[PDB]
């Protein structure tokens, strides 16, 4: 059979303070189309169904921001995928360099995330 009622699925969502799109899990259906989202950094907010993306392994050739363990932040384009023991990775071509970043280290600018709401949106 199919997966359960959103609550438990790994997805990507818009942080509600008119921000960008960050990876997380649905924790609960808040109501009326809002679902509570635990972002992978440990944060939680309510997000409307349109603003949550559940068929979103970050598409290659899409533009994204990338973050390093030494705290650096810049933007580039997905051009590969990796799996490591139980987690997911993305090769980002950033400043002309194909560099491996984490699921949660690859963050979607709001205008990128819009192009995904249409196809991947819960709403």
């Amino acid at each position: 059979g199919h997966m359960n009622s959103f609550v438990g699925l790994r997805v990507v969502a818009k942080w509600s303070s008119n921000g960008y799109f960050y990876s997380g899990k649905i924790t609960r259906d808040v109501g009326a189309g809002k679902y509570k989202l635990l972002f992978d950094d440990g944060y939680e907010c309510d997000v409307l169904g349109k603003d949550i993306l559940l068929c979103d392994p970050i598409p290659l050739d899409t533009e994204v921001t990338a973050l390093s363990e030494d705290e650096y932040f810049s933007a580039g384009v997905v051009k590969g995928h990796r799996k490591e023991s139980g987690e997911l990775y993305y090769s980002i071509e950033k400043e002309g360099q194909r560099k491996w970043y984490k699921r949660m280290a690859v963050i979607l600018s709001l205008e990128q995330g819009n192009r995904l709401r249409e196809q991947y949106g819960l709403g």
Binding site: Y20, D41, G42, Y43, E71, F73, I107
Partner: peptide
């Protein structure tokens, strides 16, 4: 000072 974007300048 810091080196990170909008919200992800979290405690770690």
């Amino acid at each position: 000072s810091t080196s990170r974007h909008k919200k992800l300048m979290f405690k770690t």
